[PDB]
Amino acid sequence: DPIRSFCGKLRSLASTLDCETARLQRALDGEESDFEDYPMRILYDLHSEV
Amino acid sequence: SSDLEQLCSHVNEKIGNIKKTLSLRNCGQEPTLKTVLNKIGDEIIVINELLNKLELEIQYQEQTNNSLKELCESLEEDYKDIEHLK
Amino acid sequence: SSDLEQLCSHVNEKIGNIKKTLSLRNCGQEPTLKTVLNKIGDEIIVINELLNKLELEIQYQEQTNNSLKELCESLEEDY
Amino acid sequence: SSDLEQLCSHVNEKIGNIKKTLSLRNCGQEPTLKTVLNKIGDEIIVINELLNKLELEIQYQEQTNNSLKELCESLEEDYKDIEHLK
């Protein structure tokens, strides 16, 4: 219990550090697609509103 | 609060702050976004002129609305004087 | 308080709980402690008897103190 | 303590609890792990027998070590005899 309860929190901070450093590099590089795909989709919604 | 939590927030801030400076780069460089951004920006200029037209059209509507009423006192005045004859 | 702190306290409790069960083993097995512990325990039995003696000695002390008054009043009568 | 934080912890717990039940599945099914797990488990059995041997070897040591004294006091009574017989 209290052994993992701590680590679980710590772990998530890791998993997060893992995942986001990965993608943010890709994003910087022009891969990963989520970063040019979604801002499109919300910009196009914003357009559709206007 | 805790030293742990305070760290996380330090991280999310760095993470989030990148993501923002990321979208700033994307939207200001990548062409497909940059058009849809100008297309909105242009369509703001027109939807702005459409306001000025709606502003004047509201005004002449007003000006007409009173002229209709000052017309209305006139034909409602002389209905009273023929009705006294009849 | 925090998941971190809560862990520490879990640890100190395990650590501390050992150290206690440690001293319990030491004091009940190791001879040099075990004597000094009986030496105290014996010297409690004597310092207990020394109380009973002090109890009676107080009792008669109080017995004689009022007998001593029983005199001092009687002299103050004839004067 | 916030409703937000409490949610996160609910999430991490679900996430973490999977990851554990994940490793439990992997380690009990996937062969490459399952060998290295038996290799350790077997090497525990041997390192356990190596203890019993070290136990007796200590014990057969401890027992010839007082017998180094029994032969120490017997060759001592002989020494005081060069004092007396010389």
From Swiss-Prot, chain A:
Subcellular localization, as worded in the UniProt entry: Cytoplasm, Cytoskeleton, Spindle; Chromosome, Centromere, Kinetochore
Residues carrying Phosphoserine: S33
Q: How does it assemble?
A: Component of the SKA1 complex, composed of SKA1, SKA2 and SKA3. The core SKA1 complex is composed of 2 SKA1-SKA2 heterodimers, each heterodimer interacting with a molecule of the SKA3 homodimer. The core SKA1 complex associates with microtubules and forms oligomeric assemblies. Interacts with SKA1; the interaction is direct.
In the record, the note on similarity to other proteins reads:
Belongs to the SKA3 family.
Q: What does this protein do?
A: Component of the SKA1 complex, a microtubule-binding subcomplex of the outer kinetochore that is essential for proper chromosome segregation. The SKA1 complex is a direct component of the kinetochore-microtubule interface and directly associates with microtubules as oligomeric assemblies. The complex facilitates the processive movement of microspheres along a microtubule in a depolymerization-coupled manner. In the complex, it mediates the microtubule-stimulated oligomerization.
Q: What is this protein called?
A: Spindle and kinetochore-associated protein 3
The record lists the organism as: Homo sapiens
What high-level taxonomic lineage is stated for the organism? Eukaryota, Metazoa, Chordata, Craniata, Vertebrata
* UniProt gene name: SKA3
From Swiss-Prot, chains B, D:
| Residues annotated as transmembrane | none
Give start-end ranges for the coiled-coil region(s). Answer: 47-86
Q: What is this protein called?
A: SKA complex subunit 1
Record localization: Cytoplasm, Cytoskeleton, Spindle; Chromosome, Centromere, Kinetochore; Cytoplasm, Cytoskeleton, Microtubule organizing center, Centrosome
What the protein does?
Component of the SKA complex, a microtubule plus end-binding complex of the outer kinetochore that stabilizes spindle microtubule-kinetochore attachments, promotes alignment of chromosomes at the mitotic spindle equator (chromosome congression) and assists suppression of the spindle assembly checkpoint. Kinetochores, consisting of a centromere-associated inner segment and a microtubule-contacting outer segment, play a crucial role in chromosome segregation by mediating the physical connection between centromeric DNA and spindle microtubules.
Concerning its family, UniProt says:
Belongs to the SKA1 family.
Q: Which domain of life is it from?
A: Eukaryota
Q: What part of the entire protein does this chain span?
A: 3 to 88 of 255
Instruction: Write the gene name.
Output: SKA1
**Species whose genome carries this gene:** Homo sapiens (Human)
From Swiss-Prot, chain C:
Record localization: Cytoplasm, Cytoskeleton, Spindle; Chromosome, Centromere, Kinetochore; Cytoplasm, Cytoskeleton, Microtubule organizing center, Centrosome
Q: Which residues form a coiled coil?
A: 47-79
Name of protein: SKA complex subunit 1
What do we know about how this protein assembles, alone or with others? Answer: Component of the SKA complex, composed of SKA1, SKA2 and SKA3. The SKA complex is a homodimer organized around a central W-shaped coiled-coil structure, formed by the interacting domains of SKA1, SKA2, and SKA3, each end of the 'W' is extended further by the C-terminal microtubule-binding domains of SKA1 and SKA3; the complex forms extended structures on microtubules. Interacts (via SXLP motif) with MAPRE1 (via C-terminus); the interaction is direct and stabilizes the kinetochore-microtubule attachment of the SKA1 complex.
What's the name of its gene? SKA1
Keywords of the record, alphabetical order, are: Acetylation, Cell cycle, Cell division, Centromere, Chromosome, Coiled coil, Cytoplasm, Cytoskeleton, Kinetochore, Microtubule, Mitosis, Phosphoprotein
Q: Which organism is it from?
A: Homo sapiens
Q: Give the UniProt family note.
A: Belongs to the SKA1 family.
A cellular component term, taken from the record's GO annotations: mitotic spindle
Q: Which residues of the full protein are shown?
A: 3 to 81 of 255
